[PDB]
């Protein structure tokens, strides 16, 4: 497909659909897609780092630049993921 642009659009879907349900961002169905999102991320580039994920997770809300845009296809998304992020990275690293 070489699109590398739909398959994280897939992503805000899969979070957002845990939206609906409101379910806890530490969900293991959730937090596990954080590591499927982790994966995802680390694949296109990069390897292991945690502490990378944790980095997007300021863009998330931090530099109204970045967090304009992504939240603009969802409102509150964007601190949803943030809480999102750090509960999958403190259950392996706090």
């Not at 969900?27 to 390897?47: C, P, T, W």
């Not at 300021?58 to 750090?86: H, Q, W």
Request: proline share 3%; hydrophobic share 35%.
């Amino acid at each position: 497909w070489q699109r590398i642009q739909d398959e994280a659009d897939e992503l805000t879907r899969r979070f957002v659909a845990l939206m609906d349900a409101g379910e806890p961002a530490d969900s293991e169905g959730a937090m596990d897609a954080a590591e499927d999102h982790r994966q995802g991320i680390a694949r296109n580039h990069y390897d292991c780092g945690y502490e990378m994920h944790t980095c997007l997770g300021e863009m998330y809300v931090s530099d109204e630049r970045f967090t304009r845009n992504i939240d603009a296809a969802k409102p509150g998304l964007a601190a949803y993921m943030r809480d999102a992020i750090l509960a999958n990275a403190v259950r392996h690293t706090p």
